[PDB]
Amino acid sequence: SSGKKPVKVKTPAGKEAELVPEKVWALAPKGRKGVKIGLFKDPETGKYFRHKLPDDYPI
DNA sequence: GTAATTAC
DNA sequence: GTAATTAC
């Protein structure tokens, strides 16, 4: 599932950016709350990276 | 090491 | 095939 709303993230280049994730999903071991992860592209470097999403972000 | 995901 | 992502 693709993302909808922009997320405030820290990029691997060390900049804060509000980005729309390309893909979002839950990362949780069995019986654990886990986290939500987004796949982002750094808007300046083109580098793909993964970053935590707010706990209540739509998947 | 687990959990899913995908760029690399 | 593996890195990288978080919290446990």
Instruction: List the A28 CA – B7 C1' distance (angstroms).
Output: 21
Which residues neighbour A52 within 8 Å (Cβ) at sequence distance 6 or greater? A35, A36, A37, A38
Burial class (CB in 10 A: 0-12, 13-18, 19+), A7: buried
Q: What is the DSSP annotation of A1-59?
A: ----S-EEEE-TTS-EEEE--SEEEEE--TTS--EEEEEEE-TTT--EEEEE--TT---
Q: Which two tokens stand for residue A1?
A: 């599932």
CB < 7 A from strand C, the residues are A 12, 27, 29, 32-35, 37, 49-52
> What number of other Cβ atoms are within 10 A of residue A47's Cβ?
12
Q: What is the resolution of this structure in A?
A: 1.9
On whether the CB atoms of residues A36 and A50 are closer than 8 A, the answer is no
Domain A1-59 CATH assignment equals 3.30.420.40: no
Structure-determination technique = X-ray
**Residue written as tokens 């939500």?**
A36
